[PDB]
Write a protein that binds this ligand. Structure first.
Ligand SMILES: *[C@@H]1O[C@H](CO)[C@@H](O[C@@H]2O[C@H](CO)[C@@H](O)[C@H](O)[C@H]2NC(C)=O)[C@H](O)[C@H]1NC(C)=O
Ligand SMILES: *[C@@H]1O[C@H](CO)[C@@H](O[C@@H]2O[C@H](CO)[C@@H](O)[C@H](O)[C@H]2NC(C)=O)[C@H](O)[C@H]1NC(C)=O
Ligand SMILES: *[C@@H]1O[C@H](CO)[C@@H](O[C@@H]2O[C@H](CO)[C@@H](O)[C@H](O)[C@H]2NC(C)=O)[C@H](O)[C@H]1NC(C)=O
Ligand SMILES: *[C@@H]1O[C@H](CO)[C@@H](O[C@@H]2O[C@H](CO)[C@@H](O)[C@H](O)[C@H]2NC(C)=O)[C@H](O)[C@H]1NC(C)=O
Ligand SMILES: *[C@@H]1O[C@H](CO)[C@@H](O[C@@H]2O[C@H](CO)[C@@H](O)[C@H](O)[C@H]2NC(C)=O)[C@H](O)[C@H]1NC(C)=O
Ligand SMILES: *[C@@H]1O[C@H](CO)[C@@H](O)[C@H](O)[C@H]1NC(C)=O
Ligand SMILES: *[C@@H]1O[C@H](CO)[C@@H](O)[C@H](O)[C@H]1NC(C)=O
Ligand SMILES: *[C@@H]1O[C@H](CO)[C@@H](O)[C@H](O)[C@H]1NC(C)=O
Ligand SMILES: *[C@@H]1O[C@H](CO)[C@@H](O)[C@H](O)[C@H]1NC(C)=O
Ligand SMILES: *[C@@H]1O[C@H](CO)[C@@H](O)[C@H](O)[C@H]1NC(C)=O
Lengths: 347, 49, 50, 298, 50
């Protein structure tokens, strides 16, 4: 019995199509030069092979000390939502983002994430998290997206072109439909110009459609800008109410406090180790550093823009990161025809 | 030590090589010294002399 | 030193750091960014050798 | 209640020059021993800033409504805490929403509401002769505030409020930006000893706060304080002295700067890459020193 | 924008142009095609469909 590993092989096919020989390209430096020259015969000489490489032994995770669960119950399960023109914004901090608690009670018709893959959410830490809440008509849900037109995306709620975060929407006909008709929810219909991203306009001034100023009287070609939705239990699906939450955050630049569910390990130093610091993953050797960070910064970057220093989120100490692959290697051979004995030079 | 003439000694002190010696060990630049010294920054990216 | 400095170019990708791209993105979407970076860095090496 | 201050002499506006002022940290990444180029909204070097006084001697209690074009560099030379805050908005008349940032004697208050601001907003400090003590008496900024969306009140402190006699001792620099619903504030405090004219030197501003207000700011107005005593006889509109203070206003533009980081991670020098052809060659060579010769610029 | 106060569209998709640029353009050889289909078949009104 033997066990297989991922390797690169150089296979040989004769003129009948059968594999008659092979070279394991990572057994020896000689085999590596065979693999590079793409031949089974090496002539006498000195060859550069590859820099000396060290493989990591351990893996470590370092997240901040967070105990509370995020307020999924007063964001997605609120008794009353806001109108789209006066939309609501709520800060989120100091909480574990374990969203699997939503599985057994909530069903979302729409859930789309921008700037991040949904399968990586469990391994990241999030900066400056906000939740925006409102209620719209079902047909208008397609308008909650970057670079959209329509009355919601022009007069009521606008997203930036470069947006990082997720949009979540679910049907709420049972909650927001009344047999007589629900007129609590309003929207803006007339506006001189389009809104800027993340801007809220809550004024109620008589809109002047043409000339002949209105003097706030609401006459011919002079309108009241806000209008009411009529939500009734027997509407088409297009006209039924939908509850919408937009989550906005930043990734991997500044100190973070949300940090989804993932267990932290011990800190091991002076060994090549795979590491995860606040969602930023890498490989290398960690050492004590003399750098002093100002309180508002978390990572340090060199001229090549790669991260070479990090503040520990537990002990608040600065650590330097060094690669563990370094140094040139050469192999001296008298020719494979003559012998298989070789010499190795470590430069 | 070097069996050089007087003029050769004068000439060799007027050109400053970028690096003296070809053995820079891994332990020599570990941590701060890396990415500050230009030779180690080169050598951590595969560039050898 | 110019070869070392040219490692901070995005070449039209989201970032110039491979570790930043590999976290926050899954393989099918990370592949296109990594491919852009690979093409740019091969071009830098080619210019140096010429 | 709002009172229109009278007995204030009108003078032509004054201008001065900014000597490499108004640099701030662009992002939150630590860097050391490096020259780094960055394109962002900066105050251009050797610009022409406007100058405002609060000097009794003329009275000259300046508080005009100013434009807010793309962000503001605000500098303040003080010794007695005269400059107290700002109001930002579009119409400032309860038809639209406005932002108030004020420092009253005890707290720092940041509110976003629909204010009916006074035509001449101010704060009032009263001085008692019988027992030497300065205390805050008046807060005349707005009539009513109705629909408040964002509010913040800081922890209580006690401020000094005592009138001083020496020359100016404190320089306070702020940078204000409004991007994608975020009001961004950078700041720095510096000790000085001078009498007039914004000073020379270099000092980078650090990130202070980032408020999610979501409003359309177009204009702004500074909030100052008054002194009243037994030597200021009259009614509300005439019985007031001033207290010396000065402030300077400049406007930010999109520029490319070459910033210098020393071995401790602080920005100690900068080059404005579009001031001069010489500065442009400095920017291209990525050095602060240029050797003798002829260079193609652009 | 005269359509805002009377019509609601479940589908609206533009090809070869961004919807935010429509207000700044001039259009050549404009035609409108009209028909009625079943709801399930709406996904088929797109290039390269079966
Ligand atoms: C922010 O407010 C300003 C001031 O009210 C708006 O700019 C004015 O717009 C009207 C027409 O929309 C023009 O007649 C004025 O000349 C403009 N004034 C200035 C100083 O530019 C501006 O449109 C508002 N921003 C948004 C996104 O609506
Ligand atoms: C201070 O002076 C201003 C004028 O600059 C007064 O504001 C005027 O008030 C009258 C009466 O309400 C209005 O008809 C005018 O339209 C106002 N002018 C402006 C420019 O708004 C203000 O009332 C005075 N403050 C007082 C009297 O306490
Ligand atoms: C700073 O800006 C002011 C205002 O633009 C300049 O003052 C103008 O100067 C020109 C030429 O001297 C005059 O024709 C204008 O009438 C001035 N305007 C005003 C409102 O007085 C000033 O010259 C600029 N430069 C300096 C160094 O102050
Ligand atoms: C400075 O402003 C703060 C905030 O408005 C004032 O604090 C409030 O004072 C009222 C009046 O007693 C209290 O009812 C509130 O509860 C206070 N808010 C707090 C403590 O957050 C403060 O009194 C003001 N100071 C001065 C000197 O006017
Ligand atoms: C902004 O303030 C106005 C005035 O207070 C609000 O309009 C009134 O709100 C009350 C509260 O329910 C209603 O009873 C009145 O019928 C409303 N209209 C009038 C003319 O008083 C308005 O709701 C506020 N805006 C927001 C977004 O809350
Ligand atoms: C290949 O096939 C031929 C014809 O069947 C045979 O003669 C020969 O021995 C086979 N093997 C090699 C190595 O040519
Ligand atoms: C949401 O609130 C209702 C109100 O009682 C409750 O019955 C339901 O279980 C809640 N769902 C959660 C917390 O997921
Ligand atoms: C977090 O945990 C570590 C070790 O458990 C402890 O030393 C530290 O004080 C805790 N709190 C913070 C804010 O780091
Ligand atoms: C004496 O000082 C206190 C507090 O400083 C003040 O309240 C009081 O009014 C002063 N005395 C008189 C007579 O005003
Ligand atoms: C940098 O920090 C060191 C140690 O705190 C200090 O001695 C030095 O004066 C600081 N400034 C410079 C320019 O080195």
């Amino acid at each position: 019995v033997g066990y297989l590993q991922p390797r690169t092989f150089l296979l040989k096919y004769n003129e009948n199509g059968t594999i008659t020989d092979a070279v394991d390209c990572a057994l020896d430096p000689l085999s590596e030069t065979k693999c590079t020259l793409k031949s089974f015969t090496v002539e006498k000489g000195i060859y550069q092979t590859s820099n000396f490489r060290v493989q990591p032994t351990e893996s470590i995770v370092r997240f901040p000390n967070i105990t509370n669960l995020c307020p999924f119950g007063e964001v997605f399960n609120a008794t009353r939502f806001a109108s789209v023109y006066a939309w609501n914004r709520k800060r989120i901090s100091n909480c574990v983002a374990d969203y699997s608690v939503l599985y057994n009670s909530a069903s979302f018709s729409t859930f789309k994430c921008y700037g991040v893959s949904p399968t990586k959410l469990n391994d990241l830490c999030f900066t400056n998290v906000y939740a925006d809440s409102f209620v719209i008509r079902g047909d208008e849900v397609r308008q909650i997206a970057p670079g959209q037109t329509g009355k919601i995306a022009d007069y009521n709620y606008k997203l930036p072109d470069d947006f990082t975060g997720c949009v979540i929407a679910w049907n709420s006909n049972n909650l927001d439909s009344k047999v007589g008709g629900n007129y609590n929810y309003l929207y803006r219909l007339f506006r001189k110009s389009n809104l800027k991203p993340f801007e809220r306009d809550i004024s109620t001034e008589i809109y002047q459609a043409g000339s002949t100023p209105c003097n706030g009287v609401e006459g011919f070609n002079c309108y009241f800008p806000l209008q009411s939705y009529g939500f009734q239990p027997t509407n088409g699906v297009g006209y039924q109410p939908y509850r919408v939450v937009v989550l906005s955050f930043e990734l991997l630049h500044a100190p973070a406090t949300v940090c989804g569910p993932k267990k932290s390990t011990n800190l091991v130093k002076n060994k090549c180790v795979n590491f995860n610091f606040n969602g930023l993953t890498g490989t290398g050797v960690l050492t004590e550093s003399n750098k002093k960070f100002l309180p508002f910064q978390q990572f340090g970057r060199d001229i090549a823009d790669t991260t070479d220093a990090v503040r520990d989120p537990q002990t608040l100490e600065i650590l330097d990161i060094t690669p563990c692959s370094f140094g040139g290697v050469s192999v001296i051979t008298p020719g494979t025809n003559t012998s298989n004995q070789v010499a190795v030079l470590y430069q | 030590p070097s069996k050089r003439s007087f003029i050769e000694d004068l000439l060799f002190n007027k050109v400053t090589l970028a690096d003296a010696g070809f053995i820079k060990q891994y332990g020599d630049c570990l941590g701060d010294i890396a990415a500050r010294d230009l030779i180690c920054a080169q050598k951590f990216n595969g560039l050898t002399v | 030193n110019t070869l070392v400095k040219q490692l901070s170019s995005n070449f039209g990708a989201i970032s110039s750091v491979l570790n930043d791209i590999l976290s926050r993105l899954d393989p099918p979407e990370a592949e296109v960014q990594i491919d852009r970076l690979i093409t740019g860095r091969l071009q830098s090496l080619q210019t140096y050798v010429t | 209640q709002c009172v229109n201050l009278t007995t204030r002499t009108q003078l032509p506006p004054a201008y001065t020059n900014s000597f490499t002022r108004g640099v701030y940290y662009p992002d939150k990444v630590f860097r050391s021993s490096v020259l780094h180029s960055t394109q962002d909204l900066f105050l251009p070097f050797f610009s022409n800033v406007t100058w405002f006084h609060a000097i009794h001697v003329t009275k000259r209690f300046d508080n005009p409504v100013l434009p807010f074009n793309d962000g503001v560099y605000f500098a303040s030379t003080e010794k007695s805490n005269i400059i107290r805050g700002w109001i930002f908005g579009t119409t400032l008349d309860s038809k639209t929403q406005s932002l108030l940032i004020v420092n009253n004697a005890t707290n720092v208050v940041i509110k976003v509401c629909e204010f009916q601001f006074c035509n001449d907003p101010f704060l009032g400090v009263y001085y008692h002769k019988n027992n030497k003590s300065w205390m805050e008496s008046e807060f005349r900024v707005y009539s009513s505030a109705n629909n408040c969306t964002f509010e913040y009140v800081s922890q209580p402190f006690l401020m000094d409020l005592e009138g001083k006699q020496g020359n100016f001792k404190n320089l306070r620099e702020f940078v204000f930006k409004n991007i994608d619903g975020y009001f961004k504030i950078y700041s720095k405090h510096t000790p000085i000893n001078l009498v007039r004219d914004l000073p020379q030197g270099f000092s980078a501003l650090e990130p202070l706060v980032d408020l999610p207000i979501g409003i359309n700011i177009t204009r702004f107005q500074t909030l100052l304080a008054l002194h009243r005593s037994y030597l200021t006889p009259g009614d509300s509109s005439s019985g007031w002295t001033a207290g010396a203070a000065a402030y300077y206003v400049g406007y930010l533009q999109p520029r490319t700067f070459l910033l210098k980081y020393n071995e401790n991670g602080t920005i100690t020098d900068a080059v404005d890459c579009a001031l001069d052809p010489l500065s442009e060659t400095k920017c291209t060579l990525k050095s602060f020193t240029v050797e003798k010769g002829i260079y193609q610029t652009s």
